[PDB]
Design a protein around this nucleic acid. Structure first.
Length: 78
RNA sequence: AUCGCUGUGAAGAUGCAGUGUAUCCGCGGCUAGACGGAAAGACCCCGUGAACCUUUACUGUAGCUUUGCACUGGACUUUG
């Protein structure tokens, strides 16, 4: 009953509409910018924004390339 | 207009009966009677009366506790 928008999770899709538990929509999926309820108020507004998502969602692993190269140097002094 | 006695009597009499005493009226005292006064007996019984206490009386119930379903999610596994 939700529209998923991210894929780096355990079961996060982007174009499948799944039926999940009621508390899993309320407290996690909706308030994190990660879904919206299956309403027909902007369901045709999703279809005019299908090519704005293909920019930032692809750099999401590309900006995690060189940022990860300073995460494993282990240069924190205790 | 308020005596004793002995009987009688709702069964212990100033008042009935019979009979003895006894002029009329205070004051001071004493308490034997007036089943003296005081409190619609406290004991006892009664009431399909009450109240409050008790419990292993009856019926409940606050509180405590158990599980089901809500609030309440994902993710692998032991597992059917």
């Amino acid at each position: 009953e939700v529209i998923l928008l991210e894929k780096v999770a355990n079961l996060g899709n982007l174009g499948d509409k799944v039926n999940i538990k009621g508390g899993y929509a309320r407290n996690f999926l909706l308030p994190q910018g990660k879904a919206t309820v299956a309403t027909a108020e902007n369901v045709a507004a999703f279809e005019a924004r299908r090519a704005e998502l293909e920019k930032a969602a692809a750099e999401k692993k590309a900006a995690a390339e060189a940022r990860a190269a300073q995460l494993s140097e282990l240069v924190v002094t205790l």
